[PDB]
Amino acid sequence: GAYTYVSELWRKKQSDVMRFLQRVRCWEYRQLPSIVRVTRPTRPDKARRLGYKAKQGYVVYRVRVKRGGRKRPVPKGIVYGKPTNQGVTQLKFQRSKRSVAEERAGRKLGGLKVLNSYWINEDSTYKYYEVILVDAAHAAIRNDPRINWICNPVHKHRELRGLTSAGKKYRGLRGKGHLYHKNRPSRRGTWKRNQTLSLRRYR
Amino acid sequence: KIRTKVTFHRPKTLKKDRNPKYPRISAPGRNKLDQYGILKYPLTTESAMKKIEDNNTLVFIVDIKADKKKIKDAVKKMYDIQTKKVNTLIRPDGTKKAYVRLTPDYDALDVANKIGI
């Protein structure tokens, strides 16, 4: 009966209490490495609703990512091409910062499976997420029927194939209908299907 | 607590020797480089025969992985003869050759006759 209280308090982000706590936490995170395990989640309710459980095999890692757009990484900012592509700055990465954080966590921890992630803090330079990961080799995970699906081989590196919640968000799968139809089953798959020239036997 | 050094040093903590529940390898491996594998065959060239006749030395073709200590031990085991010194080289064909000089107590000619050359 406390998770609702915690959730509403975290919805109140501009309150003095939240500002003080977030300031202290952001300062502390600024002093530690980019990727670091946390003993327990600092947002228990959010972790619950995203699928975390307080049992062996579940882990949480704080990940820090840099803020801003994606500068085209060409030497001296020189583009050999037409003016339309000559742009260098004000370019944006197609993936989100939380997706980057999940990818960093997954690459660093090759022996685990990235279940989910959530925003925790941010400053002008850095954004902070916590990634929930699962040890698919643990007996508790393998015997829990609600999560042992992650142990199947088809779910390898969900974060790197864009199958997480952030992955679906940046792939455009969070909506349905006339505004999102081109993204299903995938944008490239739709392009291939549309460009295919069908030549039947009897023409 | 009283600290006399400004620098912090990591404290020494106990370490435990491995005590595995199961052995990774079921049984010890076989001894590939036994005496028979070390000593391939004696050399019966003119130079080898001259060495046997003059310097009381036998010439052997030996496994490339064998060292002088192993060669001496293998010769002792096979023929029960002491060795004054073993010299080794690798021929251009890639095989190892060993000049084994027996002690004066042993006759290289008699040893060769027993071996069958």
Binding site: - | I90, R91, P92, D93, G94
Partner: protein, 50 residues
């Protein structure tokens, strides 16, 4: 050179062993098509390029 590594020496030994004519009895085998050693090498014609 006189100074050579063990690996290079072993490779040269293998090349020397491979540089030879085919056995005569190979030509008498039933349904034989090998006439000679097509991979013969001479130290002055083709270098090993090691």
């Amino acid at each position: 050179p006189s100074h050579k590594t063990f690996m290079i020496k072993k490779k040269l030994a293998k090349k020397q062993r491979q540089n030879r004519p085919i056995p005569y009895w190979i030509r008498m085998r039933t349904d034989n098509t090998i006439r000679y050693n097509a991979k013969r090498r001479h130290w002055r014609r083709t270098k090993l390029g090691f």
